[PDB]
Structure formats: C-alpha cells, structure tokens
Amino acid sequence: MNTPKEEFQDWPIVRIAAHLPDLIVYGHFSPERPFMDYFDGVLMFVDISGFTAMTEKFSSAMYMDRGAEQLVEILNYHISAIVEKVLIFGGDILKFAGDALLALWRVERKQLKNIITVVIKCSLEIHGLFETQEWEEGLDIRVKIGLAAGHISMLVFGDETHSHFLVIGQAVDDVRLAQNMAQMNDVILSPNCWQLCDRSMIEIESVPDQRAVKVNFLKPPPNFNFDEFFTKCTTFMHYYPSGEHKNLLRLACTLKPDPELEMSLQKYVMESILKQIDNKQLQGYLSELRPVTIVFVNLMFEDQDKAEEIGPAIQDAYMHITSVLKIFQGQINKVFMFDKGCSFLCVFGFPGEKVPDELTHALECAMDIFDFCSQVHKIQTVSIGVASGIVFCGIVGHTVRHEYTVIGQKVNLAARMMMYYPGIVTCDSVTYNGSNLPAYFFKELPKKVMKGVADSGPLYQYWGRTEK
Ligand SMILES: CCOC(=O)COc1cccc(C(=O)c2nonc2N)c1
C-alpha cells in the first residue's frame, strides 16, 4: 500500500487559533462570565512603537495608494521574526497592539527561576535581530523589553456570542512599568523578577529612582550549556512542539475539527476576520488606511488590586458597552489592562461597517457608556477619549500567530486623552467640528503636554445636552 504523507493542517479551526494564545486555545474553562483563574509565570512586554510610528509616513503620496499594503508587509516582516523567537523559546504570545506585544511563560512556581533565564536569553536574541537594521537611512528600528514574574490572574468576560480575556495583577502592572523604563536595546527586570531570578547568570545595574534593574549581560557559569538547559526547561512546558511535531512553531497548527471547541474559540474573533477565514472575503480586504472614530474607554477601580472585585465590574461594563456599540455598529478591537485601569479600544467605521453621523453617534455612544459605567459597583472613575481620522487596519504578526490591529496617531491620541483628562469624555478637533452639534454641548480644554503626541490640536470635553 502507498503511504501518501502530510497531515492536512489548514482547517478553519486552525486558522481561528492563529488569532489566539495557547492560554485560550488549550484553556477549557467554565461557562460562567466572569471566569477567573490564577497561576504564576514570566511576562515579556516588547515595545515596538519604534517601527509602528512609521505609520503616518505611509499615508504619504509617495506610497501611491499602497501605503496600507506596504505598511503591513514591512511591519509583519519585523514582527514575524520577534514572534518566531518567542515561540521557539517556549512563550505564548497573549495579544498584539500597535505599540506592543505581550508574551507569557506560564510555569509552576518552583521553575520561575530557570524560566526567567530562558526569557532573558530570548530577550537578548530579539535585540540581536535588530542590531544593524534600519530604513531610509534614518529610522533605526529597535525594540525595548520589560520582563516581570510572579502571580498572574486571568479574566475571561463576555456574553453568549463574544468573549475577551485579560491577564491582570501586580506582575502584569510590573511588566508595563519595566518596559516603560527601557530605552532602545534594553532589557529591564521588574523588582520581583530580579528577586526571583538566577543571579549567577546575569550582571545588572540599578535604574535611578527605581527598584527595577537593567540587564547588562547574561554571563553563565563555565560549564553551562544553554541548549541542554533549555531542554531541561521544556519538561515544564506543556505545549512545546515536540517529537513528530518538533518542526512546527505551535501545537495549535495540529488542531483538528471539533465543533464545540470551534464554537468557543470563534467568540474571541471579529466577524469580518471569520469571513476571511471562511474564504468568503478576499485575504487582503482588511489591510487598509481607513477613516475611523476611536472611542477609547478607561475604567479605574476602587480597589485596583482585587481581582475578585474587578472581574464582575468589567463584565457589567462589557455588557453595557457591547449593547451601546451594537446600536451604532461600533466594535471592540482590543481590551487592555495594566496599572492604569481596564481600557476598551472601540472603533466606529471598521471594514464595511461605515455609516454617516459616525461623529455625533460616537459622542452619544461615549456619553452613554460614561453614564452607565460610572454607576457600576467598584468602578471608581471612567474616562473616555474620542479621536477621528485615518488609521491603519490589518492583521499583524506571524502566519501562525497574528491579530487584527489598528495603528495610528489618532489611536494614540484617544489613549492619551483618556489618561490625561480623567473622569470626563474628551474629543479632538475633527470630532468637535465634524459633529456640527451645538457648541455649548462642549467645553474647550486646557492644552496638556501628553507623552507621545506633538500638536494634538484643540481638545474638548463633551459636556452633553444639558448644563446638568
Ligand atoms: C491603553 C493601553 O494599551 C496598551 O498597553 C496596549 O498594549 C498592549 C499590548 C499587549 C497586551 C496588552 C494588555 O494590556 C493585555 N493583554 O492581555 N492582558 C492584558 N492585560 C496591552
């Protein structure tokens, strides 16, 4: 008998799993929402704003109407290489955003020490990818890495049709703080990461006015062999591709059809992405420079550190946010959470979802969300930033691990507005002027210098329909 080779691996379920971490793909959780679980791990936050600040230049006429296509191609070339490193070193890419990706090595508490060593080595090899790389003579193209370790909580929230997850807690807060302190080419360790790590392996230096540390060198003992050390470490890595599948970047490439599993996983993925996955839309349809309105919602909690309390609060907020977005065809593109609160990146005018009055409706949606979420138990402060303009949309990452993402100055602007103008709904000049709503519905705001934005233009508070 002949033995034709090659398992077929391109099923819809596999395509869906590309959009999700192993944390979710192999998770098998209870149906209750919210769902919380608790574990330990090492986190890596890779700041990629260096080359995703390239976006505004790809809107130039020099790119001849293929700005979006060129941008995704070059971004994916670089981001792919980072993803491959993470995956080969045993990590799980949790989410992508325009300015970062977050990766996790989940392990039993006793192995944190050795896993930190693995993650440091991975971090250094990532920097090594970019040592002599650039573009257009100028732009150097490099990254900044923060590492953290310790207790991690996971939250899954959603309804009967849509799901979202977050990791939260001090280690999560720590990784953001660490990455923020990094300069180009740095690997910064959280205080706890430094506490837990194998101090014989590395040389560090202090970070002024900070207990976090910078890794200067990974200098292992005389008879250390990283490959043998790594192999020992794989004992504790549940899904590391091995044996017959050692040639694959992800076990998830081996997923077989399973309608119950696919039902669960598809809830995390936007319907337009599922359309492409099902070969009912062209594979490049979602790469675009598109005018949109960003509504960036931040929720700050009464007790910032109590997972048992924040979980239900996020779920209650989510249920309202989704009902309000449905009414005006808005979408949640990402949910993020560090030390600054839980933020929902909402978008109006996505792929094939554009309708006029996007602006008045975006503001009215923001106010509804603001009013409702302000009365949610345990939510201390709600802040919403509204910015409108051309943004890049597309699927960013590696073939095996990628996500639909939005990138642009207006996304960053809305995100900064929600943090620098807490407790109110703010909007940019495009939104204010475009709405044609009466001027007394707004308050002209003081100009604030916000990290990452030059010339925001005049900013406004959406005060609402009444003096009240
Ligand atoms: C408004 C703050 O926006 C950002 O910081 C975006 O950058 C990222 C990039 C990757 C993951 C995350 C997360 O916050 C989480 N992903 O999963 N759990 C999280 N927490 C955030």
Is residue 101 lining ligand 1, measured as CB closer than 6 Å? yes
CA distance 86 to 42: 12
The neighbouring-strand residues paired with 63 are none
In a domain, 384, yes or no: yes
Half-sphere exposure in the Cβ direction for 80 (13 Å, CA):
10
Distance of alpha carbon 386 from alpha carbon 95, whole angstroms: 23
Burial environment of residue 220 by CB neighbours within 10 A (0 to 12, 13 to 18, 19 or more): middle
For strands 288-301 and 342-348, give the pairing.
antiparallel
Is 338 close to ligand 1, i.e. is its CB under 6 Å away? yes
Q: Closest residue (by CA) to atom 15 of ligand 1? A: 336
Q: What distance in Å separates the CA atoms of residue 74 and residue 311, rounded to the nearest whole number?
A: 38
C-alpha dihedral (300, 301, 302, 307), degrees to nearest 10: -160
Same domain assignment for residues 299 and 234: no
- For residue 152, the cross-strand partners are 39
SS3 of 41, please?
A: strand
95, 101, 384, 404: residue to mutate for ligand 1 pocket, most atoms within 8 A of CB: 95
Kindly state the tokens that stand for 429. Answer: 């000049």
Nearest to 93 by CA among 173, 22, 7, 148: 22
Q: Where are the beta strands (DSSP E) in 67-118?
A: 92-97, 100-106
Instruction: Choose the final residue of a domain: 211, 237, 252.
Output: 252
269 lines ligand 1 (CB under 6 A): no
- DSSP class of residue 168 equals E
**Is the distance from the beta carbon of residue 144 to the nearest atom of ligand 1 less than 6 Å?**
no
Ligand 1 centroid–CA 467 distance in Å is 36
- The verdict on 87 and 215 lying in the same domain is yes
How far apart are the CA of 339 and the centre of ligand 1, in A? 11
Tokens 């008045």: give the residue.
Answer: 360
233 and 156 together in one domain = yes
Please state the φ and ψ torsions of residue 449, each to the nearest 5 degrees: -80, 115
By three-state DSSP, how is residue 458 classified? coil
Q: What angle do CA 327, 328, 329 make, to 5 degrees?
A: 100
* Domain assignment of residue 209, yes or no: yes
Q: Is the CB of 104 under 6 A from ligand 1?
A: no
Tokens of 465: 């329909």
Q: Is residue 223 part of a domain?
A: yes
Do 292 and 243 sit in the same domain of this protein? Answer: no
Technique used = X-ray
The torsion angles phi and psi of 267, rounded to 5 degrees, stand at -65, -20
Cα–Cα separations (whole angstroms), residue 283 to 49, 55, 288: 26, 21, 12
Q: Taking the chain, what is the end-to-end CA distance rounded to the nearest angstrom?
A: 82
CB neighbour list of residue 277: distance below 8 Å, 6 or more residues apart:
12, 15, 16, 269
Q: How far apart are CA 448 and CA 42, in angstroms?
A: 36
CA-nearest residue, atom 17 of ligand 1: 166
Task: Answer yes or no: are the C-beta atoms of 105 and 34 closer than 8 Å.
Answer: no
| Residue 435 Ramachandran class (φ > 0 left, ψ -120 to 50 alpha, else beta) | alpha
Q: Is 397 left (phi over 0), alpha (psi -120 to 50) or beta?
A: left
Host H or E run for residue 178: helix 170-181
Q: Is the CB of 48 under 6 A from ligand 1?
A: no
- Give helix 112-129 / helix 67-88 axis angle, nearest 10°: 140
Same domain, 202 and 302: no
Does ligand 1 have an atom closer than 6 angstroms to the CB of 116?
no
Residues 195 and 329 in one domain: no
| Ligand 1 neighbourhood includes 407 CB (under 6 angstroms) | no
Q: Establish if 306 belongs to a structural domain.
A: yes
How many other CB atoms sit within 10 Å of the CB of residue 151? 15
Neighbours of 408 (CB within 10 A): 23
| CB of 94 sitting under 6 A from ligand 1 | yes
Q: Are residues 291 and 246 in the same domain?
A: no
Pairing between β-strand 379-398 and β-strand 401-407 as defined by DSSP bridges: antiparallel
For ligand 1, what atom is nearest to the CA of residue 100?
9
- How many A from CA of 403 to the centre of ligand 1? 13
166 lines ligand 1 (CB under 6 A): yes
- Pocket flag, ligand 1, residue 172 (CB < 6 Å): yes
Query: Ligand 1 pocket, 152 CB below 6 A?
Result: no
Can you tell me the distance from the alpha carbon of 458 to that of 463, in angstroms, rounded to the nearest whole number? 16
8 A C-beta contact, residue 272 and residue 281: yes
Joined together, the tokens standing for residue 147 give: 């590492």
| 92 and 80 Cβ atoms separated by less than 8 Å | no
Distance (Å) from CA 101 to ligand 1 centroid: 8
- Quick one: which H or E segment has residue 229? helix 226-233
Q: Say which amino acid occupies 304.
A: Q
Ramachandran bin of 189, using left for φ above 0, alpha for ψ from -120 to 50, beta for the remaining angles: beta
Distance 350 CA to ligand 1 centre (A): 21
Interatomic CA distance for residues 375 and 156, integer angstroms? 22
- Same-domain check for residues 384 and 453: yes
295 lines ligand 1 (CB under 6 A): no
* Neighbour tally for 11: CB within 10 Å: 15
Cβ-based burial of 30 (10 A; exposed 0-12, middle 13-18, buried ≥19): exposed
Q: Which atom of ligand 1 is nearest to the CA of 419?
A: 1
Task: Determine which helix (DSSP H) or strand (DSSP E) holds 218, and give its type and residue range.
Answer: strand 210-218
CA of 447 to the centre of ligand 1 (A): 27
What is the residue with the minimal CA distance to atom 3 of ligand 1? 336
Q: Which amino acid is at 303?
A: D
Distance separating alpha carbons of residues 17 and 6, to the nearest angstrom: 20
**Domain boundaries, position 450:** 285-468
- Cα(432) to centroid of ligand 1, in Å? 28
Residue with tokens 């604030």: 448
Handedness of CA 70, 73, 77, 79 (dihedral sign): positive
Question: Do 456 and 450 form a contact (C-beta atoms < 8 A)?
Answer: yes
Q: Which atom of ligand 1 is nearest to the CA of 166?
A: 18
100 CB within 6 A, ligand 1: yes
In a domain, 414, yes or no: yes
Q: CA geometry: angle at 399 spanning 166 and 172, to 5°?
A: 20
Same domain for 189 and 312?
Answer: no
Give the mutation target among 48, 174, 300, 338 for probing the ligand 1 site: most ligand atoms within 8 A of CB: 338
User: What residues contact residue 130 under an 8 Å CB cut-off, 6+ apart?
Assistant: 78, 141, 142, 143
| Among 346, 323, 350, 348, residue whose Cα is nearest residue 335 | 346
Same domain, 111 and 195: yes
Give the domain-ending residue among 252, 272, 296. Answer: 252
Q: Is 97 in the pocket of ligand 1 (CB under 6 A)?
A: yes
Q: Is the CB of 337 under 6 A from ligand 1?
A: yes
| CA 397 from centre of chain | 12
**Residue 211 is encoded by which pair of tokens?**
């207990």
Q: Which of 208, 234, 252 is the last residue of a domain?
A: 252
Q: Does some domain include residue 361? A: yes
Are 135 and 118 in contact by the 8 Å Cβ rule? The answer is no
In a domain, 207, yes or no: yes
Beta strands in 11-143 (DSSP E): 35-47, 92-97, 100-106
Q: 242 and 291 share a domain?
A: no
- Number of residues in the chain: 468
Could you tell me the distance, in angstroms and rounded to a whole number, from the CA of residue 144 to the centre of ligand 1? 15
Positions at the binding site for hydrogencarbonate: 95, 167, 176, 337
Total number of domains constituting the chain: 2
Q: Look up residue 131 and give its two tokens.
A: 């040592």
CB-based contacts of 127-131 (< 8 A; 24+ apart in sequence): 127/185, 127/187, 129/81, 129/82, 129/85, 130/78
Q: What is the CATH number of the domain that holds 365?
A: 3.30.70.1230
Residues 242 and 357 reside in one and the same domain: no
Cα 290 to its chain centre, rounded Å, is: 20
Q: What share of the chain is helix, strand, coil (3-state, %, to 5)?
A: 40, 30, 35
Pairing of strands 163-168, 442-444: unpaired
Q: 423 CA to middle of ligand 1, Å?
A: 21
For residue 216, count other CB atoms closer than 10 A to its CB: 12
* Two tokens, residue 342: 């839980």
Q: How many C-alpha atoms does 86 have within 13 Å on its Cβ side?
A: 27
Q: How far is CA 13 from CA 10, 162, 268, 277, 282, in A?
A: 8, 16, 13, 9, 18
**Could you give phi then psi for residue 392, rounded to 5 degrees?**
-80, 130
Contact 296, 385 (CB under 8 A): yes
Cα separation, 93 vs 81, whole angstroms: 13
Whether 5 is covered by a domain: the verdict is no
Report the distance separating Cα 293 and Cα 355, nearest Å.
12
Beta bridge partners, 158, equal 163
What is the radius of gyration, based on Cα positions, of the chain?
22
